[PDB]
Amino acid sequence: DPAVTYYRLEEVAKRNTSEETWMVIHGRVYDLTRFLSEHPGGEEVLREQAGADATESFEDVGHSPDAREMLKQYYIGDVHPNDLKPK
Numbered sequence: 001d002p003a004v005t006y007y008r009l010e011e012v013a014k015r016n017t018s019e020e021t022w023m024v025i026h027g028r029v030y031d032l033t034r035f036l037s038e039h040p041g042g043e044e045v046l047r048e049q050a051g052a053d054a055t056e057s058f059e060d061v062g063h064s065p066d067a068r069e070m071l072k073q074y075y076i077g078d079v080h081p082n083d084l085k086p087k
């Protein structure tokens with residue numbers, strides 16, 4: 001619990017603009033505000049899903065091992081349990 005700060009998806013949803021962009025990937029929240037400019041796939045696809053769980057798009061694109069490593073530096077917390085899928 002403790003080493004983990006939780007975020008309700010309703011809060012994540014509000015970080016959907018260039019000033020502060022967050023995104024959920026496999027139950028974890030990422031502050032990608034500084035990452036936007038450096039994303040090889042470009043900014044637009046990230047703006048389209050900012051504030052939301054983009055796990056499915058992330059996985060369908062087929063990101064590389066180094067892409068997944070890059071996620072870590074932007075990890076800020078976990079999705080609140082109330083917002084998680086039931087199974």
Ligand code: HEM
Pocket residue numbers: 032035039040041042045046049054057058061062063064065066067068070071
């Ligand atoms: C809205 C979610 C995301 C979408 C739709 C997306 C989409 C894409 C697309 C379309 C490409 C180019 C495909 C190709 O290599 O031919 C790409 C490449 C890449 N993306 Fe994303 N991306 C997303 C999130 C992220 C995140 C969170 C990171 C990590 C911080 C990331 C890191 C990369 C990197 C490093 C590449 C270069 C190719 C690779 O290493 O796999 N992307 N992305």
Ligand SMILES: [Mg+2]
Pocket residue numbers: none
């Ligand atoms: Mg704040």
Ligand SMILES: [Mg+2]
Pocket residue numbers: 065066069
């Ligand atoms: Mg590695």
